[PDB]
Amino acid sequence: GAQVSTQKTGAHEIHYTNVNYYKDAASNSANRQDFTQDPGKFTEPVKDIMIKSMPALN
């Protein structure tokens, strides 16, 4: 049970291996590459869709 993942490399011109040693999931290392984004919660929390090009208010 070894996990081969992709290292953090540069763009515009590379794997590491991981084995878990302990029985608890808290003993693992950090989730350094959990890239998720949902900004709509805070920037567009309104009920109606509010298209950009249209006027906000009639």
Binding site: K8, A11, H12, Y22, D24, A25, A26, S27, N28, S29, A30, N31, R32, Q33, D34, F35, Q37, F42, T43, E44, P45, V46, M50, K52, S53, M54, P55, A56, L57
Partner: protein, 273 residues
């Protein structure tokens, strides 16, 4: 990949569409890009947001407290204790307090250093020192002396460490009784609202106890233990504005009122700063 958006090409426009005009009263933050108010070129942006994730922003070891204990004591009374909290330091407290709720595992690290004290006990040749940090969860028996029975650690977790080696480290899971750690609490502890108000209501994490496992030698010695917290496997909820005023207490959010920013000469001075 936390890759930012590419810039799209846009030429001249003349139409009824009004991307720049909006209503800020709605609470909606406008989604205008630079390609809406000017002719842009095409840019393949390879910049990524990998460093502003909440895991990377928070996964840094930070010292949260240090205390001192001696080898001679009276009588004694030469040991250390810390009631665990994350609010006695300014730096880590402000990062954790950018959110209202957080769930994470901790990486706990200790840095124990010993110092020789002024005396006339020459000559001194002292063997290597061994320290014992004991963690007593809420309700367990507390050490009263430096050699009391509680140090047996039959069920209480303890780490033994000899000087000169790597600083000790262990992992702690998420241990709260709630579904998330609270950085902020807007209620009281008692139902009648008398007593403690605020985040101190939920502070029941426990206490750490430190001592020398060695018997005290003739030469006086004082050791200081630095505790370091590192959040791991983080999940944050409800971000809030960063603390602007300087902290005063650990139990409450009491502050001294502060200006909004640094002032400048007039409304048009470009010397900012």
């Amino acid at each position: 990949i936390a890759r930012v958006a590419d810039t799209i090409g846009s030429g001249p426009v003349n139409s009824e569409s009004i991307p720049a005009l909006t209503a800020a009263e709605t609470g909606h933050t406008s989604q205008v890009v630079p390609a809406d108010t000017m002719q842009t070129r095409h840019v393949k942006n390879y910049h990524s947001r990998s460093e502003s994730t909440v895991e990377n922003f928070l996964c840094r070891s930070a010292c949260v407290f240090y205390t001192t204990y001696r080898n001679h004591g009276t009588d004694g009374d030469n040991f250390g204790y810390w009631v665990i909290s994350t609010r006695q330091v300014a730096q880590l407290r402000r990062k954790l307090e950018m959110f209202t709720y957080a769930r994470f595992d901790l990486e706990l690290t200790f840095v124990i250093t010993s110092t020789q004290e002024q005396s006339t006990i020459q000559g001194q040749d002292s063997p290597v020192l061994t320290h014992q940090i004991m963690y007593v969860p809420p309700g367990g028996p507390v050490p009263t002396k430096v050699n009391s029975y509680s140090w047996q650690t039959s069920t209480n977790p303890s780490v033994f460490w000899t000087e000169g080696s790597a600083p000790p480290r262990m992992s702690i899971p998420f241990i709260s009784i709630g579904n998330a750690y609270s950085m902020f609490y807007d209620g009281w502890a008692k139902f009648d609202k008398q007593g403690t108000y605020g985040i101190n209501t939920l502070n029941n994490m426990g206490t750490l106890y430190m001592r020398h496992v060695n018997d005290g030698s003739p030469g006086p010695i004082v050791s200081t233990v630095r505790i370091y917290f590192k959040p791991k496997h983080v999940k944050t909820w409800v971000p809030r504005p960063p603390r602007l005023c300087q902290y005063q207490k650990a139990g409450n959010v009491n502050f001294e009122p502060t200006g909004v920013t640094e002032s400048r000469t007039d409304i048009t001075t470009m010397q900012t700063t």
